[PDB]
Write a protein that binds this ligand. Structure first.
Ligand SMILES: O=P(O)(O)O[C@H]1[C@H](OP(=O)(O)O)[C@@H](OP(=O)(O)O)[C@H](OP(=O)(O)O)[C@@H](OP(=O)(O)O)[C@H]1OP(=O)(O)O
Lengths: 221, 221
């Protein structure tokens, strides 16, 4: 992250060891479940690209996930270079150069370059964009490691309706289908895969019932 | 039917043999089920009263049905004579006489008389009125031959709801109750005679639900 020194100048502060250890616990203990992404986003809050690569070292022992992340990051860097062609010409002395795809990812840049790029009015946030690339890679990894299809999430004969709903929506978060397909899933498949008593009540409830009304009508069933 | 010759004059064309054979198949194979009436109406499309009597010969071997048709036709002819008293007086040379009940049914008229009566501006359609009398007779015949009461149409334990609905409405078409009684039947008896699971859902659906909503809520039940 970025901190101000006693003289009012922006200084890079490394991630503290217990934050890094929290991220290591997330990576090594949670099997890339969907909650790895909110936790990563919280733990890399306000980070520089050099900090993000420190957090990416924890993924390297997981070769398939690390390779998927590398492919996503290379694709994003190439796309960034294509959409930001390197202008050839003079530059104002008070203006800094334009980082490349290998620079936003911190492969060839240095710490002061990233601090200066991020600390500006108006800012060009290099940490947030690299973070979004990482999150796309992690979404792909969560999709790859998902153990069940949404078609296989079915309410047990004695399972409470809220628990089935939580499992259903967690798998839906993992699968990341298209928006229209997701709407069809939540409207139709949730009712279709409920157990007989809840299914009877939900069918009687009619189409277009909100999830809150469905939870109300199935509370003790 | 009526066709125009090469000189532009209206000429009667007989019913083709395969149309008559289609009507014979309807009469001899369908046991006077309710669909005999739409089929008869389609097959006698644009017919003259002389054509209608050719189609009525097919019914003559069925003595009860033929007698019911004859009674209905005699009643309609008598009513037509009563509501159209034979005016005694001069008639315009450019105006034709008024057919009687025995003439619209083609018992005493001739082909040219019927062609001239039907081909006029404005027309006096003798084929359509005789056809409506025939249809009243056929409705009575369909009522007589109906095998089941509407009170006896009950959904089977595994019967799909759409099939029960189709049987119910077909019997209702056969029975031809009064309009208010029919509305009571479709609103109350259909729900009352459904099987337990569909009945539970329909009772939960509430009064005044449309048939489409009932079909939606019972699709796989
Ligand atoms: O309206 P319909 O009286 O039933 O007329 C049809 C129709 O003939 P037209 O349209 O020429 O009057 C058929 O023609 P398609 O368009 O089906 O071809 C024809 O069948 P063919 O094509 O075999 O000529 C058929 O004639 P057919 O009796 O030989 O089956 C004939 O029926 P009618 O002869 O009873 O008028």
């Amino acid at each position: 992250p970025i901190v101000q020194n006693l003289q009012g100048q922006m200084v890079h502060q490394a991630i503290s060891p217990r934050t890094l250890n929290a991220w290591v616990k997330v990576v090594e203990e949670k099997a890339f479940s969907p909650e790895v992404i909110p936790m990563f986003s919280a733990l890399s809050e306000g980070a520089t690209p050099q900090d993000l690569n420190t957090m990416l070292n924890t993924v390297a022992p997981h070769q398939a996930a690390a390779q998927m992340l590398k492919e996503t990051i290379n694709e994003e860097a190439a796309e960034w270079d294509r959409l930001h062609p390197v202008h050839a010409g003079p530059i104002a002395p008070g203006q800094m150069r334009e980082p490349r795809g290998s620079d936003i990812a911190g492969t060839t840049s240095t710490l002061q370059e990233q601090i200066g790029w991020m600390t500006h009015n108006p800012p060009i946030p290099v940490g947030e964009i690299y973070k979004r690339w990482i999150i796309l890679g992690l979404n792909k990894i969560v999709r790859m490691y998902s153990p069940t299809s949404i078609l296989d999430i079915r309410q047990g004969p004695k399972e409470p309706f809220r628990d089935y709903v939580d499992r259903f929506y967690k798998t839906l978060r993992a699968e990341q289908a298209s928006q229209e397909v997701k709407n069809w899933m939540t409207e139709t498949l949730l009712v279709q895969n409920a157990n007989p008593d809840c299914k009877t009540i939900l069918k009687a409830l009619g189409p277009g019932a909100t999830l809150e009304e469905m939870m109300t009508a199935c509370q003790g069933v």
